[PDB]
Amino acid sequence: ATPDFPTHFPKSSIGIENELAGLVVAMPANSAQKFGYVKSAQGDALFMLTKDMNQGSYQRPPSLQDGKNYQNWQTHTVELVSYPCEMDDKAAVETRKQAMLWLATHFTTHIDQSNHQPLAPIQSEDGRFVIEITNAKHVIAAGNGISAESQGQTITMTPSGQQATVGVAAKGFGTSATPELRLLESAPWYQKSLKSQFASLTSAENLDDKELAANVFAYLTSIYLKTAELAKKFGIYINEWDPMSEQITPNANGLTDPKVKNAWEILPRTKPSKIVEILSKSDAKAVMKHIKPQLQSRYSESLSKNVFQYFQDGGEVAGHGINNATVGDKHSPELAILFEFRTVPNELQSYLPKTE
Ligand SMILES: Nc1ncnc2c1ncn2[C@@H]1O[C@H](COP(=O)(O)OP(=O)(O)O)[C@@H](O)[C@H]1O
Ligand SMILES: [Mg+2]
């Protein structure tokens, strides 16, 4: 079994995703995403081997007929998914990039001498890296996995196949305290002006933590307003809101549609309703009560009520979120909130492996 991601980090964390070019993985239909993982010889889990984009049904080449059953098998692109590490842990970041580049060279040899065969659990030649196979019911095949033989491909990685995910303490979003926080706050959907706006609305209120409440308000309102903007732009069905009732033609498959995710640029990966937990019951009530009018002064009553209710009931920004991540003291953990960079910006390029 592939180990689950560690959930706790002392400070800000980073994970990477890297879709490979030059090969596919074929597995039985409805297989689990993870088929293996690469770890250091010391035992530290570095990245997972996963199936990513479905490339169609697998057809075992006739010249490679082996008496085996490949019925209903699907081909997918391979994505290398790192185990998160601390953002300032240079050695952990470097070992992940190096282990990914090593596995690409091992894949290049595998499609040359063992095309349409499963990867074997081996140790690298220098002894640095170890492959562990968790699902042996797979095959690795060059190109799109149609031909028995490769076109002598070198297995590569490129920025268009790359993403980075950053995890920060929820209480830090809006403080601009670290370079990571400042990069996250530069997200086009985040409206820092909502912090000072909240303070103006709540002068008569005796709030337990005014600065924290203003930060949470700005973060949540920015997400709710962006969701409403996107639902209108792309014609997305949110809860009971119907875009056709506002003469908007549906132009996306939902919140999880890749073009909707891309429109966020910096995609929230944590369930918005979790942040309410970093506040007192009283402060959370004050924050939540003030969000509704921010939507209603910009969007129709139906869109506003539906977006507000969707997130209130634990609605996700774009599918299953990373909601169990924590930061700070191991004994008293604080909520970490995660963000996916759809395109890796210049500031995070050094975290990604490069073939060239
Ligand atoms: N605590 C964390 N801090 C930072 N990045 C994390 C953390 N936990 C997971 N990630 C990263 O989240 C990314 C996507 O994770 P995952 O949920 O497995 O992908 P998917 O939803 O596409 O199946 C990976 O780059 C991974 O390293
Ligand atoms: Mg992934």
Ligand SMILES: [Mg+2]
């Ligand atoms: Mg991604």
